[PDB]
């Protein structure tokens, strides 16, 4: 329990050595998300 609190208290930081466009690609997926969900539901029905 104390070993655990110590280790977490004792943590070292990481060493790390677009946004606009990422949002456009996501926005572009939205129709595909609907179609897919709809295709999964339609399969759930025998008829």
């Amino acid at each position: 329990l104390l070993e655990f609190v110590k280790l977490l208290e004792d943590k070292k930081e990481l060493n790390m050595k677009d946004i606009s466009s990422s949002l456009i690609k996501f926005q572009s997926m939205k129709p595909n998300n609907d179609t897919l969900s709809d295709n999964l539901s339609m399969s759930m029905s025998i008829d």
Binding site: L1, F4, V5, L7, L8, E9, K11, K12, E13, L14, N15, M16, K17, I19, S20, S22, L23, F26, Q27, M29, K30, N32, N33, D34, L36, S37, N39, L40, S41, S43, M44
Partner: protein
């Protein structure tokens, strides 16, 4: 990808979930008295976390779509349908909030004017790493206060987070090593 991808989509949803909840906790601080430079930092941090959530959600859909077009059955479980609906809902939500944050950031920036656009970086991975241990440490100290189940979930959330860091589809060896070992103490505890 086998006739059942449910467990895979389930694991991705848990990752998206903990990324989304972290983003949300930042977001809720945004929604009188709050300094501009702090408002800005919070806005960026929240944005990067929604974007990371969006990456994990998108990968889920990518996997499920590939599986759906390749598997000849067309046999889906109720569960997978439900999770895919949750994924879509959450993707819409994250995307709306990320847009709102992008906008608010842009607005804030137009009330300033910089001779240091030589200038600092916010690293999403550091955000994830630090928060994950703040959760576990809060829980260990709560454990010392008495709340057995809350320590379980808290603990659980910490490991999903570190796992995202080590995941190559969702994106340093000294760091990855540091992480590669970090899950274990948390897993030991929980």
């Amino acid at each position: 990808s086998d006739s059942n991808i449910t467990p895979f989509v389930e694991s991705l949803s848990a990752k998206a979930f903990v990324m989304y909840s972290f983003a949300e906790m930042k977001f809720s601080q945004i929604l009188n008295l709050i300094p501009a430079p702090e408002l800005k930092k919070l806005c960026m941090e929240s944005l990067l976390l929604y974007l990371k959530s969006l990456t994990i959600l998108a990968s889920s859909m990518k996997l499920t779509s590939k599986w759906w077009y390749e598997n000849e059955s067309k046999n889906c479980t109720l569960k997978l349908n439900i999770l895919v609906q949750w994924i879509r809902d959450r993707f819409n939500e994250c995307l709306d909030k990320a847009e709102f944050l992008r906008l608010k950031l842009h607005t804030l920036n137009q009330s300033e004017d910089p001779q240091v656009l030589d200038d600092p970086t916010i690293f999403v991975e550091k955000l994830i790493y630090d928060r994950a241990l703040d959760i576990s440490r809060n829980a260990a100290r709560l454990e010392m206060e008495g709340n057995y189940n809350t320590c379980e979930l808290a603990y659980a959330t910490s490991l999903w987070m570190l796992e995202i860091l080590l995941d190559e589809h969702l994106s340093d060896e000294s760091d990855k090593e540091m992480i590669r070992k970090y899950v274990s103490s948390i897993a030991n505890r929980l």
